[PDB]
Q: What sequence folds into this?
């Protein structure tokens, strides 16, 4: 059952790490396996297993809780990529997207 | 070894409280209210738009007559509004343009404000009257008990009860480990609850100046707190996108108010007169109307282009007032 | 130091020894409050314009 | 029979829950290996006449799913050694993000 | 005891280029049972001191300001670094967030 | 003969079907290893007289194929250990590639 | 001896008018002070942190030489391995500053 | 069985052509011209500076009288210049400010332009619009007039076209490019034309018969410019791979590659001199490099511009070389 | 796609069935062209000022 | 292959020259000058501030009378200054706003300038000539006389020009990188050139050949200046160091560097006696080096932007610095 | 290409066959020049204001 | 004569003032003569205050 899964979050803050939502991306067969009811299939609820997707997210807001579920379902962190750069009258906003790669 | 003994007792006591709270929960609030007919869809509309603030509005407080209200903006000005005619009753220039809160005395003779100046300023409505100093942190919130007493919260992790006549702190409230963002008085003004950056809310005794109960379960800072009308419960807004109703006698969290696609902190919370509706200002520019018993969204108020910074509900429950960083105030009905 | 972890304990002791009540009863009392005053809450049952200050 | 393959996409966003939007996957490496693992999915439209065993950088994938490309490389004998994202930028701002994915032997 | 923990700091620099790394404070994030394990009493529970073990959190920080001193405690508590991500963007002052991922 | 070598390129982009365009491949490390790995492909133009066993940073590749440079190291006994993206703005882009023992 | 060492530098670039090479102003060495003297000997420049005691962590050392791979090699042959890297880069003729980090383990 | 025969035949035909081209190469252009005394350094200088363009100049095309020239700028204007007096002959407002090419009819009665509007507009000079040639689904990269009634265009839709200006309909459609076609150049007899494209290949087309005859390869990136050698048996291609390549029609292969170390930038335009000994190429590095066609050596450079040189032109009499750039200036080099 | 790949064949047939010539000759013909007309190209051999519109 | 033989042969000859240079070094400059009383602290001060430049000043060159001086700014203007009265003698508009060098003829009749236009323009003080044919940008130029000028270019070649007519009397080849600067020998028989190949080369002007090649710099050499007697020269570089090389010894005598100076050197100039080596830096300062002892004797900070050029009068009375800031400053 | 690395060799032969001199003497000759003219250098030995044009 | 920036200064009297600099040295000055009277050396880093 060799495969990959990639998760990421969008951080926007005016201070600890605050994670708005965890996006889970990969093949939908593996995505259902590693995580349980937590996934919110709302955006992509009809994808047949063995067809790839990118539109799921996690009902919980804890990044390492998602990390742990994959390391205890046989995944390991292979790569990471951060892309961050940046409307009020005084201060501005800061968007931040980072990615997390999980293998086999 | 001496520090570990006192710690292990604290851990056991925390676990002991954990088991007592679980034994008290036989059922949930959602189960007992399932047969109650939902509120449905109650439509509101902008009945008043208050203009004349030149910067971000950081706070609002209604009057006891359900007409007058005060607002605190980051331009350095306090404006008392007549909500019926939209007439400006008073415009008071502030010595520091950084102001995080305002309060309206129940008698209507005085109004207070404060902010990063670490000062609670009492304004006489019948020029500055009192400047209450001694807080080592910024002043996040304040509420009048009467004209002679006011309760404040600060970024120094401590609240305080003030004697306005003398200008000195009467009773200091300690035990918060983080910045205290908000407070709300009980109906009888004997007790008050406070939200803070330690992700906990605390019920305080005003007379005895000690913490009675401590409520937890929030995953981030609590920026807003409001008492349920009967004084037996309170709701907390937080940066974790959820509103949580706590009950005093049950000494635990009754219900969590949250919805997918709203991933933003709650700046302010206020109940309706009957307490069936819980209103929460959000960072997503909206104001969501929650069913207190059913935990469902009964409506939404979007009149603002920036986040709603403060809310208020009149004692008669006739109108809902919102305020935001877009410099406008809106009275909803 | 030691003074601080002793005051935290004495606080938690007070927090534990309190008369708790069952959620079942609490909720019943809250739910009944809401219905008691549901007719006194204008945000639930709108009022007439003649009775509406903001109209 | 040993080599390096590099795949990447360019993100284009306009401005708050936004998923990863993959316009097209670019495949870069030696042209003999690129054909091997993806077969006819490759679109040699931009660089179709390069002889096997000479390198290229102008190939893209007929599908728009990054993990589908990852799996084909994991089951044709490749491993992920490094990753790098480079994203920087009348009233709304435009988001340009380039990310890269390196696969070994 | 298998888990993931992640630490990070936020850099603040002024420009008006020899400045060394400015470590304001280290943020520690993960499951609260593991966080106490590796760092004991050094972590500061000020922001979230009522968290029950086995429930995840993100609001802890370390009373010391030495990043490699935090690294070492995990290197001989059975942790390894698997990923890193820096998010730095910006007279205005520089703001830079960097992240460090630790496995099992 | 264990050592470190680092290669990198700088992108030239302006305001997608735009492919990776590498203007020059920079070779960085000890000059003795660079000779062995890349032979006559490296361009000693900007640092011709660097003594062997003396480290340098001014060597580039006469060819413009990043993975062709990557492949030469993969069967010259090197492995990819790290990468760093530094991008700011016409668009400048500096990314780096570290190769170990 | 188990431990972590972290090296990095500051890159300043100015381009108004690529053949601009990597120019390293100074190498910063960061970690525990006992290991730092081990791998680098007398190359370390303890100028702004001379008095710290061994076994006490620091962050205020730099290298008398300006060659990254010369620092990389000294650690590869003193039993260290590269675990991670992170670059933080942000910016008439305009100027640009890039910062990069390098993590070395055990 | 029908697909199996046709698939294997395509592979064999590709291999047959590859082997035929290799057998034809006994020697190279650099070998036979090594004994030729180099031209040396023949210096040019700015004799004219044309001002009055307010934005990036995307194209230029000389007139057949070696006097008048047209320029296309992204401000939305075509300007006809008198190169001797630097007087503005005409200023024509364009309905679309995005224009990637311009052309000057050999008769001088008409001028064409096009761009991201996907339209070739024919302007009558004897100034308002006359014809709008539509039907190209991609942007207009280049166009050249055959005569007053016919014009050949290239587009980003991978197709070239022969146009009947009278009717406004495509006469012959060219469908053999697999990538965006950036440029085209007519043969001396206007019977054939070659086109560079984003597929890194050049294709010789028959105008009458409307089919690709030969296909030239070897470029590593998009081909942005193409120009015929004076006798019509060879052509040069500019590309994003920093190299210019001379291809021969009879040999059906690459004769020579023009490149130099430290030049890492694309070529926007290419044009031969009258005798064909000098090949001039506009570059993104703000310069214009003068190449020796036979010896493959750089004989000089023209840098007058503050921004990248977008287009080149050489008069039919070969007296002057005109450059244009994003710096809003045109420069006539001698 | 069989109608389509059969037209592709007829294309490659045209490219293959051509009388090719030796590079040696091609170059010789170019080289001889350049010298033939080398005196008529002012960009190599400057002209007199009286013959120069721009000078 | 044939290139591998030439590579291995060329490298071996490099080792032969390296070992001959090592055998020649019995002692060092720092050893023999250790007993020499140090210069001490020589305090200078800004005595004149030349204003009226509107953009970055990229070059300066003094006159032979130690009075007039020329400056090249990126506003597109050349200004001849009277350093005594601070009066502008001449203002010459340039056709190219990008100008990297200027030169003042020893007779004072002519002045030259150049830059990204790849043209050396000779201006008559009583445009005259445009010297073309350089395939790279014009980095530096120095007048031999009114009829001859020596230039350096980004095409890796130097050149001797006949200003009257004609071009490139002698072409100097063999640099593998852009030639950033040049300095003439006192007798104008030889000249040395620094370049981006991290090497300096001694050239014969008459015979048109490279005699010696000096190395040891770790980055581009942006500046070069002859020691007053013509037997040595100093080089500024992007490696933050200035290095004094000796012609007869054919090796590096001394390195001028400091742990706290981590920035490139745009310009170098000796004092009249040669004891002081002045270097313009990118850190907005100008450091005064002791040539014999390799110690910092002082600093000149009058400028808010990087110091692009230096000059010292033939009489040695004043030191002029120039920077990207509008102002130009005369020190003493 | 090959012609170019062959000229570099012919260069190095010339660079090698030169009369080298010991640093000891070179430096000695420089050092002695410096002291000869050290009094003629106003940047080392300041002059009086009456003798300073910039006063 | 200070090779680094001047971080701090304090007057002893009208004729003497003590300075600190980024060149790691402090100094005692005679203001009339303009020369350093007593030089204070031994700091290994930039001296911010005195």
A:
């Amino acid at each position: 059952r060799s495969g990959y899964i990639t998760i990421g979050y969008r951080g926007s803050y005016t201070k600890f790490r605050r994670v708005a939502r965890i996006t889970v991306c990969g093949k939908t067969s593996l995505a259902k396996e590693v995580f349980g009811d937590t996934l919110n299939e709302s955006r992509d609820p009809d994808r047949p297993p063995e067809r790839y997707t990118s539109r799921y997210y996690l009902k919980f807001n804890f990044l390492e809780q998602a990390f742990d579920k994959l390391s205890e379902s046989g995944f390991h962190m292979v790569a990471c990529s951060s892309t961050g750069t940046c409307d009020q009258s005084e201060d501005k906003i800061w968007t931040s997207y980072t990615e997390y790669v999980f293998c086999r | 070894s001496e520090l570990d003994q006192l710690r292990q007792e604290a851990e056991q006591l925390k676990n002991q409280i954990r088991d007592a709270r679980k034994a008290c929960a036989d059922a949930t609030l959602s189960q007992i209210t399932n047969n109650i007919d939902p509120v449905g869809r109650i439509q509101m509309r902008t009945r008043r738009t208050l203009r004349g603030h030149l910067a971000k509005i950081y706070a609002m407080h209604w009057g006891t007559d359900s007409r007058l209200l005060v607002s605190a903006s980051q331009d350095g000005k306090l404006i008392i509004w007549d909500s019926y005619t939209t007439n400006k009753v008073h415009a008071i220039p502030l010595r520091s343009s950084w102001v995080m809160t305002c309060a309206y005395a129940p008698s209507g003779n005085y109004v207070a404000c404060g902010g990063l100046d670490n000062i609670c300023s009492i304004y006489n409505l019948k020029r500055v009257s009192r400047e209450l100093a001694g807080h080592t942190g910024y002043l996040s919130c304040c509420r009048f008990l009467d004209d002679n007493q006011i309760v404040t919260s600060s970024g120094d992790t401590t609240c305080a009860l003030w004697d306005i006549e003398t200008g000195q702190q009467t009773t200091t409230f300690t035990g918060h480990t983080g910045d205290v963002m908000s407070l709300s008085l009980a109906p009888d003004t004997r007790l008050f609850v406070s939200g803070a950056c330690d992700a906990s809310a605390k019920l305080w005794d005003v007379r005895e100046g000690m913490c009675r109960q401590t409520f937890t379960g929030h995953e981030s800072d609590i920026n807003a707190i409001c008492f349920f009308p009967n004084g037996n419960a309170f709701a907390t807004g937080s940066d974790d996108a959820t509103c949580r109703l706590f009950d005093l006698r049950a000494d635990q969290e009754l219900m969590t108010y949250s919805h997918d696609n709203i991933i933003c902190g709650i700046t302010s919370v206020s109940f309706s007169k009957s307490g069936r509706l819980l209103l929460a200002g959000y960072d997503d520019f909206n104001c969501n109307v929650w069913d207190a018993l059913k935990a469902d969204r009964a409506g939404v108020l979007a009149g603002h282009d920036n986040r709603v910074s403060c809310l208020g509900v009149t004692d008669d429950g006739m109108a809902v007032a919102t305020g935001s960083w877009d410099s406008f105030l809106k009275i909803w009905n | 130091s030691i003074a601080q972890a002793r005051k935290l304990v004495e606080q938690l002791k007070m927090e534990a020894n309190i008369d708790r009540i069952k959620v079942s009863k609490a909720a019943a009392d809250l739910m009944a409050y809401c219905e008691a005053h549901a007719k006194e809450d204008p945000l639930l049952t709108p009022v007439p314009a003649s009775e509406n200050p903001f109209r």
